[PDB]
Amino acid sequence: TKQEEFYA
Amino acid sequence: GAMGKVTHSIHIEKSDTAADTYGFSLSSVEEDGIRRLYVNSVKETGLASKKGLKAGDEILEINNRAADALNSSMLKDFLSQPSLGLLVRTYPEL
Ligand SMILES: *S(=O)(=O)c1cccc2c(N(C)C)cccc12
Ligand SMILES: [Cl-]
Ligand SMILES: [Cl-]
Ligand code: NA
């Protein structure tokens, strides 16, 4: 699983 | 190629607007009590792609700071800037 994700 | 660790230092620069993106995402993943940051996707037409960032690269450092020492507030701060420094572990494709 991934904890979370960011994009820029 | 073989099993050796290769790292890639990348400096990306762009216009400082909410419309000019780097074109990549990163994920935080925990496995067996160890957290790593990975390149989750790279936009095929974006700056990050042009600069050789690859999906699956492991982010080791952002802006001279260890990835495991980075929290979400720091990530938001860093990613909102018009320049960005990344140190990634990168794998031969084949
Ligand atoms: S998890 O085990 O559901 C999960 C889901 C999606 C991606 C994962 C990765 N990628 C290499 C980022 C590693 C470990 C777990 C994981
Ligand atoms: Cl997931
Ligand atoms: Cl993307
Ligand atoms: Na997923």
Question: What kind of architecture, by CATH, is found in domain B1-94?
Answer: Roll (2.30)
Please, which experimental method was used?
A: X-ray
Q: How far is B73 from chain A (nearest CA, A)?
A: 11
Q: What is the resolution of this structure in A?
A: 1.5
Whether the Cβ atoms of residue B38 and residue B53 lie closer than 8 Å to each other: no
Please report, for chain B, the start and end positions of each structural domain, with discontinuous segments joined by +.
Answer: 1-94
Whether the Cβ atoms of residue B85 and residue B65 lie closer than 8 Å to each other: no
Whether the Cβ atoms of residue B6 and residue B89 lie closer than 8 Å to each other: yes
**Read out DSSP for B64-75?**
TEEGGG--HHHH
Task: Find the A6 Cα to ligand 4 centroid distance in Å.
Answer: 13
Tell me the C-alpha distance between B78 and B94, whole Å: 32
Whether the Cβ atoms of residue B78 and residue B59 lie closer than 8 Å to each other: no
Tell me the C-alpha distance between B39 and B22, whole Å: 12
Mutate which of B26, B29, B91 for ligand 1 pocket (most atoms within 8 A of beta carbon): B29
B85: nearest Cα among B69, B66, B62: B62
35-94 in chain B: CB under 8 A from chain A = 35, 40-41, 72, 75-76, 79-80, 84
Which whole-number Å values give the CA distances from B48 to B30, B31, B55, B85, in the listed order? Answer: 24, 26, 10, 11
